[PDB]
């Protein structure tokens, strides 16, 4: 324990990245 904010910051941004991919996959099947 020393920089939870830093490590936590990646966990958050990393989640957003997967979120975008999730909707994208749905758009490829739904839209396309």
């Amino acid at each position: 324990c020393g920089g939870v904010q830093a490590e936590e910051q990646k966990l958050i941004s990393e989640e957003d990245l997967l979120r975008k991919r999730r909707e994208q996959l749905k758009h490829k099947l739904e839209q396309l």
Binding site: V4, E8, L11, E14, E15, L18, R19, R21, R22, L25
Partner: protein, 32 residues
């Protein structure tokens, strides 16, 4: 430090959960 696993778990759950969805998602998209 008294909220590392608590916060990390929230991210890990959402994360690992997104991968499980995206993984199975694209797996089906490949078929169609």
């Amino acid at each position: 430090c008294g909220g590392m696993r608590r916060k990390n778990d929230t991210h890990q759950q959402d994360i690992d959960d997104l991968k499980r969805q995206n993984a199975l998602l694209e797996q089906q998209v490949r078929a169609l």
